[PDB]
Design a protein around this ligand. Structure first.
Ligand SMILES: [Zn+2]
Length: 257
């Protein structure tokens, strides 16, 4: 019960919050998973791959430029804010709150989350395919050749941008082709991020799963090994161990008050 879960929440000195696509969808974010896993003639699973970027980097850039640009009109919801406010309060008490997420839209960052573990990278981060440098990039568009490009509708002509006119590395004497700093399909997670993650899960005394569940990716990598230690896990979704049904923007302000 919410009443018994708040008994744990008050005693909990290290809370791990696993945030799923649901936390992002509640803010009207095009989650390119399930029914909405489409951008024109293709599936998101067909565009987010090292082979797709190798054959057509311009098409993969048109798709990722679209995703960066849809965020302009998007705001952090009541769930994100409740999560950010919780970490601030408990922080002043010498207690820990950390957010583990595969959402690449930075709405936890805009909310005010500090202990944020983005296991799949960010839309607003680049990586040079040549020198390997990682950089923050919020520039709109990312490059002048992508001005007015990336429309989601099928049939839309391919921008057909030559590699030289695509996003390039601003490091002195590099000029290498940039790629978004996001984990693609068949790509491994950063071992540094997973080390940090496994460290969090090993030290926490309370674990929450929001906008996803322990039976679907990525919570299935983390929440069950937590439950196995006898640490309480509380699931929160639209569908000890707790379950709180409903939109996280409704249930989390109450739970994390
Ligand atoms: Zn470079």
């Amino acid at each position: 019960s919410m009443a018994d879960f708040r008994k744990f929440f008050a005693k909990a000195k290290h809370i791990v919050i696993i945030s799923g696509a649901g936390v992002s969808a509640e803010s009207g974010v095009p989650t390119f998973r399930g029914a909405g896993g489409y951008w024109r003639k293709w599936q998101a699973q067909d565009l987010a791959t090292p082979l797709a970027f190798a054959h057509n980097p311009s098409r993969v850039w048109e798709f990722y430029h679209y995703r960066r640009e849809v965020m302009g009109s998007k705001e952090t919801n009541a769930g994100h804010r409740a999560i950010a406010e919780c970490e601030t309060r408990l922080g002043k008490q010498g207690r820990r709150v950390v957010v583990i997420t595969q959402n690449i839209d930075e709405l936890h960052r805009k909310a005010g989350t500090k202990n944020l573990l983005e296991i799949h990278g960010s839309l607003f981060k680049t990586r040079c395919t040549s020198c390997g440098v990682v950089a923050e990039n919020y520039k709109s568009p990312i490059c002048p050749a992508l001005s007015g490009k990336g429309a989601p509708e099928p049939g839309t002509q391919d921008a057909s941008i030559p590699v030289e006119k695509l996003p390039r590395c601003e490091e002195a004497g590099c000029g290498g082709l940039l790629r978004p700093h996001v984990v693609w399909f068949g790509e491994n997670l950063d071992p540094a991020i997973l080390e940090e993650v496994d460290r969090e899960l090993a030290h926490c005394d309370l674990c929450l799963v929001v906008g996803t569940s322990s039976v679907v990716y990525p919570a299935a990598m983390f929440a069950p090994q937590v439950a196995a230690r006898g640490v309480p896990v509380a699931e929160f979704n639209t569908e000890f161990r707790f379950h709180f049904q409903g939109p996280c923007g409704t249930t989390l302000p109450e739970a994390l008050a």
